[PDB]
Amino acid sequence: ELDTPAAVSVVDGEEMRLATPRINLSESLTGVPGLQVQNRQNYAQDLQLSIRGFGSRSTYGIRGIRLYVDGIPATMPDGQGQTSNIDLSSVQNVEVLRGPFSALYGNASGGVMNVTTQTGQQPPTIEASSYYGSFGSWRYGLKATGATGDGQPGDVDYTVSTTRFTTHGYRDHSGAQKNLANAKLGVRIDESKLSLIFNSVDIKADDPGGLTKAEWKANPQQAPRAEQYDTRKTIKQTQAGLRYERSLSSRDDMSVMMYAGERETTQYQSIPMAPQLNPSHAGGVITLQRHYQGIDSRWTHRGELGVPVTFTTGLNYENMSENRKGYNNFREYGQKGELRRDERNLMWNIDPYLQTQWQLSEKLSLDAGVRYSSVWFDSNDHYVTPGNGDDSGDASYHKWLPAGSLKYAMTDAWNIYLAAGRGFETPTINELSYRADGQSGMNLGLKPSTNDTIEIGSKTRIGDGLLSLALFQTDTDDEIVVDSSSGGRTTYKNAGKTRRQGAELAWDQRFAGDFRVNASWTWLDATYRSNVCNEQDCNGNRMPGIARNMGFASIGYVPEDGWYAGTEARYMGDIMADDENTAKAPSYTLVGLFTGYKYNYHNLTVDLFGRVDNLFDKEYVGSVIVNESNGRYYEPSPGRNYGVGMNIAWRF
Ligand SMILES: CCCCCCCCO[C@@H]1O[C@H](CO)[C@@H](O)[C@H](O)[C@H]1O
Ligand SMILES: [Ca+2]
């Protein structure tokens, strides 16, 4: 796991946990270049997450990227993803792979992110963590982690974590309640190993919603429709995963990973009463009950014929079957009335793949991989009323995704690389559902997006840190956009190309006395090359969500036995919220400071810390609902907030 193969960046857990609420990924990995993450502070929705513009256009979920929590997929076959599962009080590391090689990781993999949980070791240590922040937020958690032996057959290892978090919300109708349970266990079968994962999330959050420009300027914490319709969500999910690994040959390894999980959600929307009267409308309440399961097999043969070549092959099967329903708001009233939608939508994914690393010469290697994505959608519709036809339908998609990188080592401390690949974006099941034709059935004409990505990078170990550089462009084509939309049913279309250019620069350094410095910047000019609007020429326009410029810089003094401190700074360029480029979110800069003491006397380790976020009380909006239907894009953010945390660790 070294910064050297490609444009890959790895963030450590104990540092992502250092004087932080341990709630949102945003607070931790906000500095990875090319990775745009913003915390909506709305636990009825997901983080605004994107990689080099991938998934930026997404409105309510995360799309166009790949996320794995302990090898369990967080993005579904169709590309839709979520973020509520991550327990930051028990994370080992987060690896982000951006660039063409992300295409190895599924259908809509413009960039793949992999979260893995702590392994546990000697001694059996128990931790009690607590944090309290402004606007009535507070979180606590217990983590027990240890091992039965050294690290041998029979040697077992355990890590359990539970956390509970509740907030009264900065803005009206935003209080949330979130409980996490995350466990990981391992047993050494022989010198062949095994592992189990158990994930559980339970959220009951009020969705504040968005605010229109006039509404945000007038009052920042206002949530007019929030209490009018009781906009809120409740999420519950449990995942079980199982992984086996065994070294067959002295030079050939192999592994298999399978997962089973169940998600269940309820969303009360702020949809008015008039539009729902049309018999074809789906309602104002969305109910979703999905089962997902999958199996992934990998064979890594370090056998070398032709040159020193190590290659990995494998097969992946992913399955998600959902029963989806909809309801009224009438009795808009806060509870749900007559049933107005019913379906079973299955989506499953099959595809082989393989990567190879050839050490053609010394200080020059060629990495190359391919994958054949095959995705199937079926919808069995159960709602056929006089006006709402039988919308059942079925479709499939296939594509060859290839990727490759040439790596040349100027030294062992400096390696440069050049990579390229093609990408793929299937239409979501929600996108095919309806057609502007008016005929009953799926819109079988819609085809997926094509990519065309090129990148160069230079990774240099200087001092005890690393300086990485990367430059990239992406050719999007057949972008899936909206065509018609009336009577509560949105229809989609293929129209237009796009081009997205950008650059990433990062530098990390550490010095004796643990003086640590970190910096990074990222440029992204993502423009359209074709009209993607029925009534307006949107050709030259920006891409909404992407920040033309962003940057991060932090400096920290971290002694191991006493007073520690640090301070961060984050710059976010002006980001457009429309395809037409009708609205913009301000360019804003935000500062943060923190101090604390780490008293570790023999077994007990008591860590105490305080935090000032948004030190200069800058007023801003840190999230936007891209392409909101009615123009309510803005999601304001609090000003100069604080937090304080206390952690206790006892070692056995
Ligand atoms: C290791 C197993 C890899 C191949 C797994 C293929 C299993 C997918 O099987 C599919 O299941 C769907 C419902 O679940 C059915 O609708 C399809 O008829 C069937 O092909
Ligand atoms: Ca129907």
XYZ file of C-alpha atoms and ligand atoms in Angstrom:
673
model
C 0.000 0.000 0.000
C 2.582 2.587 -1.108
C 2.152 5.850 -3.000
C 3.834 4.738 -6.201
C 1.547 2.698 -8.535
C -0.755 5.504 -9.705
C -2.890 8.446 -8.484
C -3.757 6.805 -5.186
C -3.905 8.517 -1.818
C -4.185 6.840 1.576
C -5.325 8.526 4.797
C -4.603 7.115 8.257
C -7.316 6.500 10.813
C -5.711 7.594 14.066
C -4.981 10.953 12.426
C -8.420 11.154 10.874
C -9.546 10.651 14.488
C -7.265 13.280 16.052
C -9.328 15.843 17.947
C -12.336 15.360 15.688
C -16.015 14.630 16.405
C -15.539 11.302 14.613
C -18.875 11.767 12.854
C -18.372 12.770 9.221
C -15.680 11.713 6.778
C -15.650 15.348 5.670
C -13.864 16.411 8.862
C -11.042 13.943 8.189
C -10.133 13.476 4.508
C -11.033 16.993 3.376
C -7.529 17.462 1.967
C -7.113 14.560 -0.458
C -6.449 16.262 -3.820
C -9.044 15.700 -6.500
C -11.532 14.412 -3.904
C -14.297 16.963 -3.319
C -16.107 16.142 -0.065
C -18.530 18.475 1.710
C -20.656 17.769 4.788
C -24.267 18.849 4.261
C -24.854 18.575 8.039
C -28.103 16.862 6.997
C -28.296 13.260 8.213
C -31.303 12.593 5.994
C -28.891 12.873 3.026
C -25.371 11.848 2.017
C -22.070 13.695 1.818
C -21.490 15.776 -1.291
C -18.777 13.456 -2.612
C -17.053 13.483 -5.989
C -13.724 12.512 -7.534
C -12.352 14.755 -10.298
C -15.897 15.771 -11.191
C -17.303 12.228 -11.086
C -20.666 12.225 -9.319
C -20.739 16.004 -8.874
C -24.063 16.339 -10.724
C -25.793 14.010 -8.240
C -28.694 15.616 -6.399
C -29.579 13.438 -3.382
C -27.296 10.384 -3.364
C -23.732 9.741 -4.393
C -23.345 8.568 -7.989
C -20.662 7.765 -10.523
C -18.094 6.483 -8.003
C -17.289 3.302 -6.071
C -17.270 3.028 -2.268
C -16.399 -0.068 -0.221
C -16.642 -0.370 3.556
C -14.646 -3.431 4.635
C -14.918 -4.797 1.116
C -18.716 -4.394 1.246
C -20.014 -2.225 -1.634
C -21.751 0.995 -0.652
C -22.653 1.834 -4.258
C -25.202 -0.405 -5.931
C -24.833 -2.012 -9.361
C -26.792 0.827 -10.968
C -24.235 3.310 -9.593
C -26.249 4.875 -6.758
C -24.407 5.052 -3.442
C -24.715 6.150 0.174
C -22.449 7.142 3.054
C -24.169 6.534 6.419
C -22.393 3.245 7.221
C -18.941 4.546 8.193
C -18.059 4.432 11.914
C -15.127 6.822 12.287
C -14.383 5.595 15.838
C -13.035 2.272 14.472
C -11.410 2.915 11.065
C -7.933 1.778 10.042
C -7.468 3.695 6.796
C -9.205 5.106 3.735
C -7.647 4.519 0.311
C -8.878 6.598 -2.625
C -7.905 5.484 -6.121
C -8.566 8.247 -8.624
C -7.817 8.029 -12.306
C -8.271 5.447 -15.039
C -7.490 2.436 -12.844
C -10.612 3.191 -10.795
C -12.398 1.738 -13.839
C -11.262 -1.695 -12.633
C -13.712 -1.395 -9.728
C -17.078 -1.543 -11.434
C -19.639 -0.037 -13.763
C -19.631 3.598 -12.657
C -16.116 3.796 -11.206
C -14.647 7.156 -12.102
C -12.867 6.954 -8.786
C -12.902 4.203 -6.172
C -12.732 4.697 -2.407
C -12.012 1.830 -0.010
C -12.602 2.084 3.738
C -11.192 -0.672 5.944
C -11.708 -1.188 9.672
C -9.226 -1.769 12.491
C -7.802 -5.262 12.955
C -7.098 -5.435 16.699
C -3.965 -6.762 18.388
C -2.210 -7.192 21.729
C -3.220 -6.063 24.315
C -6.996 -6.269 24.732
C -7.702 -2.541 25.030
C -11.029 -0.851 25.782
C -11.713 2.744 24.739
C -14.515 5.102 25.769
C -14.717 8.095 23.427
C -16.921 11.144 23.874
C -17.382 14.406 21.996
C -19.664 17.412 22.442
C -20.144 20.269 19.998
C -22.330 23.302 19.518
C -25.926 23.269 18.305
C -26.538 20.478 20.803
C -24.470 17.763 19.125
C -22.870 15.011 21.151
C -21.517 11.537 20.474
C -20.084 8.727 22.567
C -18.788 5.246 21.940
C -17.210 2.088 23.308
C -14.546 0.149 21.414
C -13.090 -3.153 22.600
C -10.169 -4.451 20.542
C -7.631 -7.191 21.156
C -6.143 -10.517 20.119
C -5.642 -14.029 21.480
C -2.137 -14.466 20.090
C 0.862 -13.035 18.271
C 0.798 -11.547 14.788
C -0.256 -18.613 13.791
C -3.146 -21.108 13.734
C -5.735 -20.610 16.456
C -4.706 -16.963 16.910
C -7.907 -14.894 16.957
C -8.466 -11.125 16.852
C -11.451 -8.941 17.719
C -12.603 -5.339 17.350
C -16.094 -4.162 18.348
C -17.259 -0.552 18.299
C -20.552 1.069 19.222
C -21.333 4.759 18.976
C -24.390 6.912 19.578
C -24.753 10.470 18.282
C -27.543 13.034 18.577
C -27.903 16.644 17.430
C -30.449 19.437 17.781
C -29.391 20.866 14.427
C -27.912 24.246 13.609
C -30.870 25.142 11.371
C -34.550 24.590 12.061
C -35.873 21.059 11.606
C -32.470 19.406 11.343
C -32.058 17.380 14.546
C -30.873 13.837 13.898
C -30.196 10.647 15.868
C -27.646 8.083 14.629
C -26.444 4.840 16.249
C -23.572 2.792 14.831
C -22.490 -0.768 15.592
C -19.440 -2.077 13.721
C -17.655 -5.337 14.535
C -14.797 -7.216 12.856
C -13.458 -10.640 13.887
C -10.697 -12.873 12.555
C -9.470 -16.449 13.073
C -6.252 -17.972 11.690
C -7.364 -21.301 10.218
C -3.800 -22.280 9.294
C -0.565 -20.811 7.970
C -5.268 -19.594 5.353
C -7.156 -16.920 7.329
C -10.788 -15.846 7.752
C -12.752 -12.747 8.750
C -16.299 -11.592 9.555
C -17.749 -8.077 9.344
C -20.925 -6.813 11.001
C -22.167 -3.285 10.220
C -25.312 -1.629 11.584
C -26.714 1.886 11.153
C -29.884 3.406 12.652
C -30.733 7.012 11.718
C -33.897 9.049 12.420
C -33.062 12.482 11.035
C -35.115 15.504 10.037
C -34.205 16.723 6.546
C -34.016 20.540 6.669
C -34.081 20.792 2.885
C -32.714 23.528 0.690
C -33.179 27.295 0.495
C -33.578 29.548 -2.524
C -31.177 32.434 -3.113
C -33.708 34.977 -1.820
C -34.580 32.703 1.115
C -30.936 32.109 2.074
C -29.998 35.781 1.821
C -33.053 36.747 3.882
C -32.473 34.211 6.698
C -29.803 31.460 6.807
C -31.325 28.967 9.271
C -34.820 29.093 7.709
C -36.587 25.844 6.760
C -40.069 26.856 5.582
C -41.398 23.636 4.080
C -39.502 21.476 6.589
C -42.183 21.661 9.278
C -44.925 22.196 6.685
C -44.454 18.627 5.423
C -42.289 17.236 8.285
C -39.494 16.515 5.803
C -37.522 13.732 7.429
C -35.912 10.377 6.788
C -35.316 7.229 8.815
C -32.618 4.765 7.734
C -31.813 1.295 9.085
C -29.216 -1.055 7.656
C -27.256 -4.150 8.621
C -24.460 -5.795 6.652
C -22.694 -9.114 7.174
C -19.521 -9.908 5.273
C -17.153 -12.856 5.182
C -13.646 -13.042 3.720
C -11.225 -15.947 3.242
C -7.586 -15.827 2.131
C -5.012 -18.571 1.560
C -1.493 -18.749 0.119
C -1.604 -21.653 -2.329
C 1.862 -21.451 -3.881
C 5.049 -19.811 -2.688
C 4.391 -17.194 -5.399
C 0.614 -17.434 -5.890
C -2.079 -16.162 -3.509
C -5.873 -16.087 -3.754
C -8.881 -14.731 -1.855
C -12.689 -14.593 -1.845
C -15.088 -12.085 -0.260
C -18.859 -12.341 0.051
C -21.383 -10.013 1.613
C -25.058 -10.028 2.545
C -27.005 -6.967 3.638
C -30.420 -5.364 3.976
C -31.321 -1.664 3.744
C -34.659 -0.032 4.623
C -35.531 3.662 4.243
C -38.465 6.084 4.453
C -38.344 9.588 2.962
C -41.093 12.148 3.550
C -40.742 14.727 0.776
C -42.019 18.315 0.628
C -44.163 17.695 -2.480
C -47.331 19.875 -2.567
C -50.843 18.484 -2.834
C -51.707 19.692 -6.347
C -49.175 17.676 -8.418
C -50.014 14.469 -6.540
C -53.648 14.586 -7.720
C -52.661 13.398 -11.197
C -53.231 9.612 -11.103
C -49.761 9.064 -12.600
C -47.978 10.748 -9.672
C -45.830 8.661 -7.316
C -46.710 10.597 -4.136
C -44.699 12.482 -1.549
C -43.439 9.546 0.538
C -40.824 7.091 -0.776
C -40.363 3.705 0.923
C -37.476 1.411 -0.040
C -36.696 -2.142 1.158
C -33.660 -3.677 -0.546
C -31.583 -6.820 -0.117
C -28.069 -6.847 -1.552
C -25.526 -9.640 -1.755
C -22.375 -10.396 -3.661
C -19.258 -12.486 -4.125
C -15.797 -11.493 -5.386
C -12.995 -13.936 -6.243
C -9.363 -12.887 -6.806
C -6.320 -14.931 -7.909
C -2.913 -13.213 -7.683
C -0.147 -15.134 -9.459
C 3.296 -13.615 -8.973
C 4.597 -16.207 -11.400
C 6.724 -14.412 -13.971
C 6.985 -15.612 -17.586
C 7.972 -13.113 -20.268
C 9.316 -10.680 -17.647
C 8.935 -10.228 -13.848
C 5.126 -10.060 -14.019
C 2.624 -10.284 -11.174
C -1.016 -10.496 -12.257
C -4.394 -10.540 -10.501
C -7.587 -11.957 -12.050
C -11.073 -12.538 -10.692
C -14.848 -12.428 -10.960
C -17.440 -10.201 -9.280
C -21.179 -10.713 -8.727
C -23.310 -7.962 -7.155
C -27.056 -8.158 -6.551
C -29.611 -5.680 -5.236
C -33.342 -6.395 -5.247
C -35.609 -3.683 -3.883
C -39.304 -3.495 -3.146
C -40.168 0.188 -3.691
C -43.417 1.883 -2.682
C -44.811 5.391 -2.655
C -47.520 7.201 -0.767
C -49.431 10.447 -0.461
C -48.939 13.124 2.160
C -52.670 13.871 2.388
C -54.917 12.726 5.215
C -49.686 18.425 3.063
C -50.250 16.343 6.223
C -47.180 14.850 7.887
C -48.065 11.156 7.574
C -48.701 9.008 4.440
C -52.126 8.202 2.895
C -53.209 6.038 -0.067
C -50.501 3.861 -1.715
C -49.472 5.321 -5.092
C -46.552 3.129 -6.195
C -45.443 -0.480 -5.888
C -42.658 -2.463 -7.541
C -39.846 -4.940 -7.208
C -36.707 -3.667 -8.934
C -33.813 -6.079 -9.214
C -30.373 -5.065 -10.420
C -27.471 -7.495 -10.648
C -23.919 -7.282 -11.927
C -21.584 -9.877 -13.453
C -18.152 -9.246 -14.881
C -14.633 -10.663 -15.087
C -11.445 -8.610 -14.891
C -7.681 -8.761 -14.430
C -4.591 -6.590 -13.761
C -0.928 -7.254 -14.589
C 2.340 -5.623 -13.472
C 5.323 -6.339 -15.742
C 8.818 -5.296 -14.657
C 9.887 -5.085 -18.293
C 13.166 -3.415 -17.308
C 14.590 -2.190 -14.032
C 13.095 1.182 -13.078
C 10.377 0.731 -15.712
C 7.196 -1.324 -15.364
C 3.889 -1.572 -17.197
C 0.625 -2.009 -15.289
C -2.390 -2.964 -17.394
C -5.902 -4.144 -16.576
C -9.241 -4.849 -18.226
C -12.811 -5.578 -17.143
C -16.033 -6.552 -18.949
C -18.954 -4.952 -17.112
C -22.385 -6.541 -17.566
C -25.366 -5.018 -15.735
C -28.994 -6.203 -15.695
C -32.081 -4.244 -14.596
C -35.580 -5.670 -14.138
C -38.631 -3.872 -12.759
C -41.822 -5.784 -11.995
C -44.473 -3.112 -11.464
C -47.464 -3.855 -9.238
C -49.342 -0.523 -9.597
C -51.658 -0.389 -12.635
C -54.515 2.068 -11.884
C -56.803 3.787 -14.418
C -54.192 6.310 -15.521
C -50.989 4.643 -14.294
C -50.016 1.951 -16.793
C -47.989 -1.230 -16.328
C -44.455 0.135 -16.122
C -42.648 -3.185 -15.869
C -39.564 -3.454 -18.016
C -36.134 -4.950 -18.364
C -32.791 -3.890 -19.830
C -29.084 -4.736 -19.888
C -25.717 -3.126 -20.646
C -22.232 -4.381 -21.558
C -18.940 -2.601 -21.985
C -15.216 -3.266 -22.207
C -13.436 -1.025 -19.693
C -9.626 -0.995 -20.173
C -6.958 0.904 -18.190
C -3.175 1.120 -18.242
C -0.201 2.949 -16.736
C 3.504 3.163 -17.567
C 5.657 3.717 -14.462
C 9.269 4.904 -14.723
C 11.472 5.237 -11.634
C 13.859 8.188 -11.887
C 15.104 6.924 -8.501
C 13.576 4.836 -5.740
C 12.371 8.069 -4.112
C 10.842 9.453 -7.342
C 8.563 7.522 -9.701
C 6.633 9.099 -12.566
C 3.672 7.507 -14.311
C 1.307 8.012 -17.242
C -2.087 6.291 -17.409
C -5.228 6.205 -19.548
C -8.587 4.451 -19.646
C -12.191 4.291 -20.786
C -15.125 4.574 -18.428
C -18.772 3.747 -18.157
C -21.943 5.059 -16.564
C -25.055 2.939 -16.802
C -28.414 4.696 -16.443
C -29.901 4.260 -13.007
C -33.052 2.188 -12.651
C -34.881 5.414 -11.763
C -33.751 6.933 -15.084
C -35.244 4.224 -17.339
C -38.490 4.006 -15.347
C -40.479 6.290 -17.638
C -40.515 7.606 -21.190
C -41.806 10.849 -22.677
C -43.466 8.675 -25.319
C -46.467 8.085 -23.075
C -46.363 4.358 -23.832
C -46.266 1.942 -20.922
C -42.881 0.348 -20.355
C -39.269 1.195 -19.794
C -37.442 3.716 -21.971
C -35.280 1.188 -23.802
C -33.631 3.771 -26.063
C -31.444 5.369 -23.389
C -27.798 4.267 -23.540
C -24.980 4.875 -21.047
C -22.219 7.446 -20.857
C -18.781 6.812 -22.303
C -15.544 8.160 -20.885
C -12.010 8.753 -22.168
C -9.477 9.678 -19.466
C -5.768 10.556 -19.672
C -3.448 11.331 -16.741
C 0.196 11.907 -15.752
C 1.785 11.998 -12.302
C 5.033 12.385 -10.390
C 5.471 10.981 -6.880
C 8.625 11.931 -4.984
C 9.667 11.015 -1.455
C 11.381 14.118 -0.022
C 12.579 14.217 3.567
C 10.251 12.038 5.625
C 7.249 13.067 3.531
C 6.007 12.800 -0.038
C 5.235 15.301 -2.786
C 2.790 14.068 -5.410
C 1.656 15.718 -8.634
C -1.057 14.704 -11.098
C -2.668 16.193 -14.227
C -5.747 14.790 -15.967
C -8.455 15.255 -18.587
C -11.698 13.369 -19.228
C -13.834 13.113 -22.385
C -17.444 12.437 -21.448
C -19.916 11.494 -24.148
C -23.557 10.461 -24.325
C -24.133 12.310 -21.059
C -27.485 11.221 -19.620
C -29.677 14.293 -19.026
C -33.369 15.153 -18.540
C -35.523 15.465 -21.667
C -39.173 15.806 -20.610
C -40.735 16.054 -17.178
C -44.413 16.491 -16.353
C -46.981 14.893 -14.094
C -44.424 13.651 -11.586
C -42.633 11.378 -14.077
C -39.197 12.443 -15.310
C -37.927 11.229 -18.682
C -34.282 11.105 -19.707
C -32.200 11.347 -22.860
C -28.683 11.106 -24.294
C -27.241 14.389 -25.556
C -23.842 15.959 -25.615
C -20.169 15.547 -24.803
C -18.140 17.196 -22.085
C -14.500 17.761 -21.287
C -13.046 18.070 -17.797
C -9.422 19.118 -17.243
C -7.700 19.536 -13.906
C -4.683 19.118 -11.683
C -3.837 17.815 -8.204
C -0.827 18.752 -6.079
C -0.037 17.422 -2.609
C 2.855 17.582 -0.172
C 3.225 15.967 3.246
C 6.196 16.292 5.581
C 7.080 15.266 9.174
C 10.025 16.454 11.353
C 11.581 15.332 14.643
C 9.553 16.482 17.607
C 6.668 15.444 15.348
C 6.217 18.757 13.595
C 3.896 17.879 10.701
C 2.856 19.943 7.678
C 0.371 19.083 4.919
C -0.761 20.977 1.838
C -2.662 20.334 -1.373
C -4.433 22.199 -4.163
C -6.740 21.166 -6.988
C -7.920 22.878 -10.176
C -10.833 21.611 -12.293
C -12.227 23.221 -15.448
C -15.141 20.920 -16.329
C -17.116 22.331 -19.254
C -19.801 21.062 -21.588
C -19.046 20.573 -25.276
C -22.685 20.185 -26.359
C -26.127 21.559 -25.593
C -27.753 19.605 -22.761
C -30.831 21.806 -22.249
C -34.077 21.733 -24.215
C -34.799 25.475 -24.113
C -31.300 26.882 -23.592
C -27.885 26.419 -25.171
C -25.859 25.131 -22.206
C -22.841 24.332 -24.386
C -20.092 26.451 -22.910
C -21.434 26.219 -19.390
C -19.666 24.955 -16.288
C -20.360 21.683 -14.575
C -22.410 22.207 -11.390
C -20.758 21.047 -8.185
C -17.138 21.274 -9.338
C -14.969 23.960 -7.725
C -12.664 25.577 -10.348
C -10.148 25.894 -7.487
C -9.830 24.335 -4.051
C -7.059 23.872 -1.531
C -6.125 22.695 1.932
C -3.246 23.329 4.322
C -2.639 22.135 7.885
C 0.166 22.397 10.439
C 0.372 20.423 13.687
C 2.645 19.974 16.723
C 2.068 16.442 17.983
C 4.232 15.356 20.921
C 3.333 11.898 22.130
C 3.243 12.557 25.882
C 1.860 16.054 26.343
C 0.380 19.266 25.011
C -0.429 18.904 21.303
C -2.075 21.320 18.884
C -2.871 21.938 15.232
C -4.608 24.180 12.737
C -6.257 23.641 9.345
C -7.379 25.863 6.466
C -9.741 24.979 3.594
C -10.467 26.983 0.407
C -13.455 26.083 -1.790
C -13.875 27.770 -5.153
C -17.145 29.133 -6.430
C -19.249 26.162 -7.543
C -22.225 26.407 -9.891
C -25.507 24.763 -8.900
C -27.140 24.554 -12.357
C -26.442 23.095 -15.758
C -27.614 26.418 -17.157
C -25.219 28.102 -14.662
C -28.040 30.195 -13.226
C -26.834 30.090 -9.612
C -23.427 30.032 -7.966
C -22.169 29.187 -4.523
C -19.606 31.620 -3.092
C -15.910 30.947 -3.064
C -15.089 30.695 0.642
C -12.114 30.129 2.957
C -12.454 28.487 6.380
C -10.013 28.145 9.303
C -9.864 25.769 12.252
C -7.758 25.345 15.380
C -7.445 22.732 18.098
C -5.377 21.863 21.152
C -5.262 19.108 23.735
C -3.293 16.930 26.121
C -2.518 13.209 25.915
C -1.807 11.857 29.421
C -0.703 8.231 29.035
C 0.563 7.019 32.438
C 1.166 3.246 32.281
C -2.052 1.489 31.138
C -4.428 4.467 31.213
C -4.380 6.890 28.280
C -6.651 9.913 28.749
C -6.854 12.161 25.691
C -8.549 15.554 25.962
C -9.014 18.116 23.221
C -10.860 21.242 22.180
C -11.654 22.621 18.749
C -12.599 25.940 17.155
C -14.085 25.498 13.674
C -14.685 28.481 11.396
C -12.447 30.625 13.576
C -13.175 33.932 11.800
C -16.980 33.353 11.772
C -17.101 33.537 7.964
C -20.687 33.196 6.731
C -21.054 30.701 3.899
C -22.946 27.864 2.234
C -20.998 24.595 2.260
C -23.413 22.413 0.272
C -25.741 22.768 -2.713
C -28.497 20.528 -4.083
C -27.276 20.281 -7.677
C -30.079 20.884 -10.201
C -32.810 21.124 -7.567
C -36.190 20.952 -9.271
C -37.473 24.322 -8.046
C -34.191 26.204 -7.626
C -33.782 25.732 -3.848
C -30.090 24.879 -4.108
C -28.486 26.537 -1.085
C -27.616 24.776 2.190
C -26.086 27.349 4.569
C -23.449 26.425 7.117
C -22.930 27.527 10.738
C -20.433 30.123 11.909
C -17.567 29.746 14.387
C -18.639 26.536 16.132
C -16.723 24.602 18.777
C -16.212 21.065 20.013
C -14.564 19.192 22.864
C -13.678 15.527 23.147
C -12.393 13.122 25.766
C -11.120 9.613 25.081
C -10.092 6.960 27.585
C -8.034 3.902 26.671
C -7.295 1.051 29.077
C -4.922 -1.724 27.987
C -5.150 -5.251 29.416
C -20.488 -17.128 -7.980
C -21.802 -16.925 -8.721
C -21.552 -16.025 -9.933
C -22.739 -16.074 -10.886
C -23.997 -15.676 -10.121
C -25.166 -15.503 -11.082
C -26.439 -15.483 -10.247
C -27.442 -14.482 -10.808
O -28.602 -15.158 -11.177
C -29.678 -14.321 -11.517
O -30.445 -14.128 -10.366
C -31.475 -13.235 -10.676
C -32.249 -12.907 -9.396
O -31.366 -12.965 -8.311
C -32.437 -13.867 -11.676
O -33.435 -12.921 -11.956
C -31.740 -14.267 -12.969
O -32.580 -15.131 -13.685
C -30.454 -15.015 -12.632
O -29.639 -15.064 -13.774
Ca -47.415 1.536 -12.851
